[model samples]
Target: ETPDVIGKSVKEAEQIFNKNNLKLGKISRSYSDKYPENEIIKTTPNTGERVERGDSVDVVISKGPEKVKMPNVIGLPKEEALQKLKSLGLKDVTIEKVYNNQAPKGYIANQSVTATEIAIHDSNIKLYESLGIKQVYVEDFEHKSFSKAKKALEEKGFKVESKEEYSDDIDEGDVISQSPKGKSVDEGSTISFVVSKGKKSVKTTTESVDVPYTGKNDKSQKVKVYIKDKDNDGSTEKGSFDITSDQRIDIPLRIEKGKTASYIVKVDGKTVAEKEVSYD
Candidate 1:
């Protein structure tokens, strides 16, 4: 019969084998995480299996976990770092690419395990490969507040430069335009912005309309022009002109660029025409 020797040391198992009239045979070593070094792992005829008297019993001893010194992988090339870990007999490892400002591209930036003795079969190393300096896309600042957008880009390590302009379409206190807007760039890139000063005060322009006499070539008439804006507003006597025979007379008034102009023309006290007009 084979005696139990799963947790016993080598010499203890030998003493027990002697008492049972069983002699120790081949002794082998193997790595085991469950048992400490030099402890009996198992026997050929495990536990209490039947065996001839004075028969040889072979036993396997635990060498604990196989360990080696973890090599320095930081700052090394990605391929070289992996080769070193494999050379050190480490098989389990996770790799990832990360943005690193200090390390060059394709170089190892960091590792999970430092330089120390680590169990070979029981440890897993994680290596972070560098992709060099961090890159960022310039954010959209059009139609956004100039100060706020500047601050936002400044926080991301970008330099902000701005110019102010009166925009007719963009709102007040907002960015009207940008240069290299929304482009991919490295950190600390400079961003150019055009800030808006709100729609320029509606400019005043001279609004006018042309009226032709269309009469006989030799005939003459006194043409008077009057202009008005609102339904309840008073009318304006623009001017009086001597328009002769098929000639055109232009009636003019000063009003906002976007407003409408209503004017009437009279030919020698006779109402000739009335119409609405505006300027660009």
Candidate 2:
């Protein structure tokens, strides 16, 4: 006889089937909020029916309530992070605003679940958004190269203004001193610096070098070139190019008198070739 196994634990169901001379077949798992975990939700063959003495009955077991892992959305844009949470079966998402110095504006600064936490489906989640970088400490810029100091300040969203001054201790094209040095300042603030002018003007030379590209793979790769000032301290991207086959490209670079210039070539962000050129 086909025996009833629904609402019974899988172990109990197996024992009952054995007692009735029926064999237990394959079992499958599925999510169910109503049925208890590891319990027999239903059987393939209907209960209370006539069957062979050794007939096998397949079973569907419940896995309890549906659950999901919280994904890391911190540092992502607010809308992009919210979309990801919702896509991961989280529906009860809430937004919380906070001022974060590190995270940029309109981006997620923090989260309630802290990524990878186990939670029930549709659980409420909170995400904090950045208002903008808070007022932060400014590094001292006295006696630093003008190019290097300017790059650092501009990257932090600060405006830079410069004036010339003659300094016997400081070299030409360098910062003599800066105002409000080593102080806290709001984002997008202005900073002024006095530059040193040497007795004579500095001279520079420009030349183009052919950077040959060699690769056997047919896959396309992204190539980037960076130029750095060898005299004091500064770096800038020359340009980026795409290559699929072996080829050669000539890149122009400027070198200061009596200084060595370094060229860095990158393929897919990995350094592939590097060389230093000396100009005297």
Candidate 3:
């Protein structure tokens, strides 16, 4: 009653001779020779009809002996398999698929029904599909330390690219650069870049002050020298002490922070260092 066939061979098509109340005779040589077993061409009294009992029904069957056309399916995605078959003349084809690590998901892998040769319309083509590709999001490594930055990207499936540089501001091993700054790149994408190590500026300055002797008999000048402590912060402190009979001396050393803290040079000073020295 239901062969589910719009077009099939006589053997493939279902016969309902009961409506005609006529017993089925041996298929004619034309029907047998033309439409082999399991090959249906078409059916009369098609599905969805209720004829009186004992009515005779004639069904057109595929004479497999005749040429059958095969369909063409290539380069199309797995999702479009149905559409592809309709174009190829196949009707009601079912699809099955499997996953592949290398292939992108929803794409066709191959088919059981190949486009080997051209045949009559309505040939069946069974195609296999791939599971498709996996995507990953690119992580943000902006302004992060070198080690921290690498760990961030790597944990998210990115390969880090490294470069070397010198800095006086940022500490070494700090992040200096990154690729694909703010976008989702493919997982395992190579991210090339560098890290910061801080700025690079260190130079020294020198100054000399005269030293006077405390004893009259001693003409030697005892110089007391010290620098100021501006900012009064923990980081910036007074400079080192220096003493000599002659004011002709050079003090050259790179200093950190802003402004020099130098004390008035005192000759024959009670203390050789900054004890009670104040700016004039």
Best by lDDT: 1
- Which candidate achieves the best TM-score against the true structure? 1
**Per-residue lDDT over 1-280 for candidate 1, one digit per residue giving the tens place of the 0 to 100 score:** 8898888998999999999999998999999878999999989888899988899899999999888998988999988998898898898888899998778999999989987879987597899999987888888988989889988899989989987778888888799888767787777878888888776552234544456665566777788777775221335466677876555555445455667757777878887788775644
Error of 3 at 28 (Å): 5.5
List residue ranges in candidate 2 displaced over 4 A: 1-4, 18-22, 32-37, 46-55, 63-69, 98-105, 117-120, 131-280
RMSD values, in order shown: 20.4, 14.9, 21.2
The global C-alpha lDDT for each of the candidates, from Candidate 1 onward, is 0.81, 0.78, 0.53
lDDT of 2 by residue, 1-280 (tens): 7899998987999899999999998999988767889888888786887789899999999988787788888899999998898787787888887778778889999988867644465566888999876785667979889888889988987899997767778899888889767998777778899998864333344544444455556667878878665333325567688887655655455567777776787877888777776765
Q: For model 3, what is the alpha-carbon lDDT of residue 244?
A: 38
List the lowest-lDDT window of 10 residues for candidate 1.
229-238
To one decimal, what is the Cα RMSD in angstroms of model 2 from the true structure? 14.9
Q: In angstroms, give how far residue 106 of model 1 lies from its true place.
A: 3.3
- C-alpha TM-scores of all predictions: 0.51, 0.38, 0.38
Question: Where does candidate 1 stray beyond 4 Å?
Answer: 24-30, 42-52, 55-58, 139-149, 155-182, 188-280
